[PDB]
Amino acid sequence: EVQLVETGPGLMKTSGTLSLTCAVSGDYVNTNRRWSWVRQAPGKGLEWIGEVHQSGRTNYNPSLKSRVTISVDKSKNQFSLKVDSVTAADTAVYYCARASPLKSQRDTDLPRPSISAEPGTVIPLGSHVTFVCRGPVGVQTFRLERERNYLYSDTEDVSQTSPSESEARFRIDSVNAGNAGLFRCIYYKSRKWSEQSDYLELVVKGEDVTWALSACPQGELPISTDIYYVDVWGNGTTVTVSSASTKGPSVFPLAPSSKSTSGGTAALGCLVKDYFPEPVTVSWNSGALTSGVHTFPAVLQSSGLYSLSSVVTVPSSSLGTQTYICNVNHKPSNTKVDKKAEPKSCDKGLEVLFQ
Amino acid sequence: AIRMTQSPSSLSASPGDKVSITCRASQHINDSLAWFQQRPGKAPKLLIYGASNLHSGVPSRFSGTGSGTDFTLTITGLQSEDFATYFCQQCNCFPPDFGQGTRLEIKRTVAAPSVFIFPPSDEQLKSGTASVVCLLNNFYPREAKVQWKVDNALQSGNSQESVTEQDSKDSTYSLSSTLTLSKADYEKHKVYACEVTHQGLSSPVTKSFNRGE
């Protein structure tokens, strides 16, 4: 159904502004989801970058809040991530994700409503806040309730957003101190009132005052009673950042010391060394050699360049019977080098090295 | 933030076994946790949300339990597609941090590595560097030790390792250790030895060569 594809630079230079966009297909971005970015360094696990909300509110992991910006373009159904002033440690596979308020596939046809705040639940004094009550389809009345100094407000404007949800909005234009406290929604449908929603606290912030009742760590109150889980991941795009330039690999043979007390089986390989752009294909004898090859992952040395090895194991009698050629092509420089690996001859004597 | 700790870090099993992975949160999060599966190279996928509710389309061998601070993902009918890495994520408070993940590996009979040593090519020493490579072939499990000795002296800091993924058929691993020296340093000594200790080995296996021969 829904599909997210990430586009961005394959290789990016250090210290520059990284920009990726996510194209959403089969869903509209102007719905009640949170579009997120998540990052995975090479072999280190998941790190959450941030999210954007339908109201335009964004939230960033405080590790990178200095450098990250998330935005949405509704016209083309895309959303973008921009991270400034990149270290080499920002090299990673980046995923865009859709976080949705999944609900237990329970259905009572009279489920409990939810309440949310936009832009959030901590509002400066005098600024606006909007509550969004959401429930099932066919809701005839929505009421927003305040707990302490109990007052309530009814609204009969209700829109279908899907064949299973409906929502209603209550806007306070200039919040004062007396607006702070607990809020919850309840809806009227099928001739009876529903269960009350859970409470959401709205706090008002002033010059030197915070009007809050007295949950989560240090701050960061929830802004909805619904938990948003990421139910759709993109395949991710790998971005590499490095202070380097495209370079062809040096290829060296790993020869099995022609007589080496060798028993039944033998091994021999190719060592591809110091090539910048990550992908390199190594096939032996251009394909005719399949069973027994083992080519290892690249390793990032402080040279900023990569190096790996590819090895095959052979019958120990195959010295002269077959000549082995390893075929390494580096497409980003289109350096197609092929080198035949054979043992060194004992005729020439003793190799001497000095200076 | 809230710290999620998964247990164990790694785990070995065979197709058909029932496995359980734990995730413990630092504080109470009211079921606000999700389980994700990530196979090697591909993108993550949602298994359970709300700590116990099975996402649509994923098989029922997967199951989620727990709340408060302790949650458990269990697979009963292990199949080949389940051998992947699993992550927990807390989704209640602002930074929805993941766990460090747990990798699920195929359990296999112990197999000793076939060890080989490779001297540097003459073409490499023209550029002033020497790389000697030790290869450990088709062993299980991965926990293996490679040590370099240059004229009987144990080497440290000048070798990097790189191990393959579990192979599709034998479920074995292969390791590559590379010792990199300058041609100047390579000149100074004669005997280069790679010493490998593995549980499939009764005693450590040492393969060596003499420079120039």
Author numbering:
A (entry chain A): 1 to 214, 222 to 362
B (entry chain D): 2 to 214
Original paper wording:
RIFIN also mediates immune suppression through activation of inhibitory immune receptors including leukocyte-associated immunoglobulin-like receptor 1 (LAIR1) and leukocyte immunoglobulin-like receptor B1 (LILRB1). Notably, human monoclonal antibodies that contain LAIR1-domain insertions in either switch region or between V and DJ regions have been isolated from donors, who have had malaria. To define the structural basis underpinning interactions between wild-type and antibody-inserted LAIR1 and polymorphic RIFIN, we investigated the overall architecture of three types of LAIR1-inserted antibodies, determined crystal structures of LAIR1 in complex with the RIFIN-interactive regions from two RIFINs (PF3D7_1040300 and PF3D7_0401300), and used the resultant structural information to derive a LAIR1-binding signature and to identify RIFINS from diverse Plasmodium species capable of recognizing LAIR1.
LAIR1-containing antibodies have distinct insertion modes, including type-1 insertion between V and DJ junctions in CDR H3 region, type-2 insertion in the S region between VH and CH1 region, and type-3 insertion in the S region with deletion of VH and CH1 gene. In this context, we note that receptor-based antibodies, such as the LAIR1-inserted antibodies analyzed here, have been optimized by B cell-based mechanisms of affinity maturation and may thus exemplify “less-escapable” solutions for pathogen recognition.
